[PDB]
Amino acid sequence: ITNLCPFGEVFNATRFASVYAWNRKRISNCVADYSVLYNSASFSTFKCYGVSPTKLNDLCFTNVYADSFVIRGDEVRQIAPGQTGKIADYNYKLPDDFTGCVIAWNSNNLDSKVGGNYNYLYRLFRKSNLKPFERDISTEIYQAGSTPCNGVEGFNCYFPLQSYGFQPTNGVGYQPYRVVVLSFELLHAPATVCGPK
Amino acid sequence: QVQLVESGGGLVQAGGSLRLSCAASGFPVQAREMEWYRQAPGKEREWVAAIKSTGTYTAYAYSVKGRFTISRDNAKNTVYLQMNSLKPEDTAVYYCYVYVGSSYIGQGTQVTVSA
Amino acid sequence: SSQVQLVESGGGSVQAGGSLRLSCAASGSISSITYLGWFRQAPGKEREGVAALITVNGHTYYADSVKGRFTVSLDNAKNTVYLQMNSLKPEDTALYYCAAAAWGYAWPLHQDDYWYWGQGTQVTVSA
């Protein structure tokens, strides 16, 4: 308790991670005010699983995790339990029994550029699907054919990551959105993250 | 089994046009987002365009917007990339892509634009 | 399911430039409703979001095509949400659905999220 939880450091970070290299911040030993985030004018998505979003301040958890990254607007719906697609399968995966909330907002004026922003990447090729909450930052050449690649990008030898090329004149579904996933963890230890009072 | 086959590439003069096609098998094109990428030797793979039937239906890389148009013929299960006002910087192998439980990308079609 | 029940009314036929007002009355587990959406669908086309309202604060969202013409509002006393449709045009012709959600809010609307659905009311705008 005592001090309010440092959610501002997560939501107001100037730089956000690429989804393949998604960031995680642990939140503990603090008073969490979720209602002020939910009630704000700030987000276009605030969707919860296993909890009611309007009673978040009434709840207590052992730890909270805050994962953050940038993806396309029309990819935000892959950030949910039970989804498939290149993001849910190769980049960031939620478990079926996810308890938590997914928060997103359009970041076109920060993360798109005239001429294209190439800084944000996603994984386009992978041998198998990620486990829930798994991260893969490898850049091994993906062997698509029968011939081995020996670390050289080339014919049937794919570099596994891809730049989004976010550019501001596409419709919102292809504009960048910043995403924060709050995972609510309840172990067999006392709760250290509760709402106010 | 899912397959994509790109056609239509060739050698063109700058300012000319080409119509690329992506013939899809194993899934309905209207049920999946389909994308064009391009890559020149020794250069990074570049996202070119996308088409789907929900949310924002089409999108383009900044440098091809206004010159390229992506479209879809459900009956022929094919996606097209009409490329107008071609420039030497458009020279590349062009690939069609879909995600159907996993990533699928074609063998590509070569586009060369002389100055 | 039937946890939240939505009944629409107010649709009909109008000439281009006219106005309509759709109503959607909610019953059942109404305290759980976090979000009210108006969708529309013409046959063979996408069921697309038109407008939405967040119940905790009354914040509203509108599709670009209807901004300045449509207004969504909520009467909490009657538990009824309204879509006022002004300056109608043939392009607005569709079956309009009211929908209610309890998991928070998400804009743009997507019909594959878990929604409680009204039965739909037809709007037909003639040139």
The structure tokens listed for C9 are 């009314």
Report whether the peptide linkage leading into residue A132 is cis, meaning its omega lies within 30 degrees of zero.
no
Q: What top-level class would CATH report for the domain B3-113?
A: mainly beta
Q: Which chains touch C (3 or more CB pairs under 8 A)?
A: A, B
Q: How far is CA A94 from CA A52, A78, A187, B32, in A?
A: 18, 9, 18, 22
Which DSSP letter does residue B65 get? B
Lateral strand order in the sheet of C70-75:
C4-9, C20-28, C80-85, C70-75
Q: How far is CA A66 from CA A92, A183, A196, B12, in A?
A: 13, 7, 19, 51
Residues of A whose CB is below 8 A from B37 = 162
What is the C-alpha to C-alpha distance for residues C10 and C82, in angstroms, rounded to an integer?
Answer: 9
Instruction: Find, in chain C, the residue whose alpha carbon is nearest to that of A41.
Output: C59
Chain C closest CA to A49's CA: distance in Å? 7
**Phi then psi dihedrals of residue A42, to 5 deg:** -90, -30
What's the gap between Cα A18 and its chain centre? 9
DSSP collapsed to 3 states, C8-25: EECCEEEECCCCEEEEEE
The structure tokens listed for C85 are 């449709």
Instruction: Find, in chain B, the residue whose alpha carbon is nearest to that of C45.
Output: B53
Instruction: Name residue A177's beta-bridge partners.
Output: A71, A106
What is the C-alpha to C-alpha distance for residues C16 and C69, in angstroms, rounded to an integer?
Answer: 13
Q: Which of C35, C34, C39, C32 is nearest to C3 (CA)?
A: C32
Furthest-apart CA atoms within chain C: distance in Å: 41
The structure tokens listed for C75 are 């009467």
**Phi then psi dihedrals of residue B8, to 5 deg:** 110, -15
- Given CB atoms, is C113 within the 8 Å cutoff of chain B? no
Residue type, B5: V
What is the C-alpha to C-alpha distance for residues B68 and B8, in angstroms, rounded to an integer?
Answer: 14
Q: Which residues of B touch A (CB under 8 A)?
A: 37, 44-47, 50, 52, 54-63, 65, 99, 101-103, 105
Per the listing, tokens 């209610």 go with: C100
Domain coordinates in residue numbering, chain C = 4-125
What is the C-alpha to C-alpha distance for residues A61 and C126, in angstroms, rounded to an integer?
Answer: 56
Q: Which of A47, A42, A49, A7 is nearest to A26 (CA)?
A: A7
What is the C-alpha to C-alpha distance for residues A78 and A94, in angstroms, rounded to an integer?
Answer: 9
- Given CB atoms, is C91 within the 8 Å cutoff of chain A? no
What is the C-alpha to C-alpha distance for residues A168 and A116, in angstroms, rounded to an integer?
Answer: 8
The total number of residues shown for chain A amounts to: 197
Looking at domain C4-125, its CATH superfamily turns out to be Immunoglobulins (2.60.40.10)
Calculate the CA dihedral of residues B84, B86, B92, B93 and round it to 10 degrees.
30
- Given CB atoms, is A98 within the 8 Å cutoff of chain C? no
Residues of B whose CB is below 8 A from A89 = 102
Q: Please tell me which of the candidates A85, A115, A173 has its beta carbon nearest to residue B99.
A: A85
Q: Is the dihedral of CA A9, A12, A17, A22 positive or negative?
A: positive
- Given CB atoms, is C110 within the 8 Å cutoff of chain B? yes
Residues of A whose CB is below 8 A from B65 = 167, 169-170
What is the C-alpha to C-alpha distance for residues A111 and A98, in angstroms, rounded to an integer?
Answer: 28
Beta pairing class for A193-194 and A30-31 = parallel
What is the C-alpha to C-alpha distance for residues A87 and A73, in angstroms, rounded to an integer?
Answer: 12
Phi-psi region of B61 (alpha: psi -120 to 50; beta: other; left: phi over 0): beta
Lateral strand order in the sheet of B68-73:
B3-7, B18-25, B78-83, B68-73
Pick from C35, C62, C103, C110 the residue to mutate for testing the A interface (most A CBs within 10 Å). C103
Q: Which of B18, B6, C107, B5 is nearest to A172 (CA)?
A: C107
What is the C-alpha to C-alpha distance for residues A68 and A178, in angstroms, rounded to an integer?
Answer: 7
CB pairs under 8 A between B and C: 5
* Number of C-beta neighbours around residue A70 at 10 A: 26
Contact A127, A137 (CB under 8 A): no
The structure tokens listed for A68 are 């953050």
Q: Which of A5, A134, A135 is nearest to A63 (CA)?
A: A5
The structure tokens listed for A71 are 């993806």
Q: Which chains touch A (3 or more CB pairs under 8 A)?
A: B, C
Domain coordinates in residue numbering, chain B = 3-113
What is the C-alpha to C-alpha distance for residues A120 and A166, in angstroms, rounded to an integer?
Answer: 8
Verify whether the Cβ–Cβ distance C32 to A52 is below 8 Å: yes
Residues of B whose CB is below 8 A from C110 = 54-55
Verify whether the Cβ–Cβ distance B102 to A89 is below 8 Å: yes
Contact B85, B102 (CB under 8 A): no
Q: Which of B78, B49, B91, B46 is nearest to B66 (CA)?
A: B49
Q: How far is CA B11 from CA B16, B63, B89, B90, B112, in A?
A: 10, 20, 13, 11, 5
SS3 for C41?
strand
Q: Which of B4, B7, B10 is nearest to B91 (CA)?
A: B10
The structure tokens listed for A53 are 């979003």
DSSP collapsed to 3 states, chain A: CCCECCHHHHHCCCCCCEHHHCEEEEECCEECCCHHHHCCCCCCEEEEECCCHHHHHHCEECEEEEEEEEEEHHHHHHCCCCCCCHHHHHCCCCCCCCCEEEEEEECHHHHCCCCCECCCEEECCCCCCCCCCCCCCCCCCEECCCCCCCCCCECCEECCEEECCECCCCCHHHCEEEEEEEEEECCCCCCCEECCC
Residues of A whose CB is below 8 A from C115 = none
What is the C-alpha to C-alpha distance for residues C21 and A129, in angstroms, rounded to an integer?
Answer: 48
Instruction: Find, in chain C, the residue whose alpha carbon is nearest to that of B54.
Output: C46
CB pairs under 8 A between A and C: 39
Task: Name every residue whose Cβ is closer than 8 Å to that of residue A171 and which is 6 or more positions away in sequence.
Answer: B55, B56, B57, B58, B59
Contact A106, A76 (CB under 8 A): no
What's the gap between Cα A21 and its chain centre? 9
Verify whether the Cβ–Cβ distance C104 to A172 is below 8 Å: no
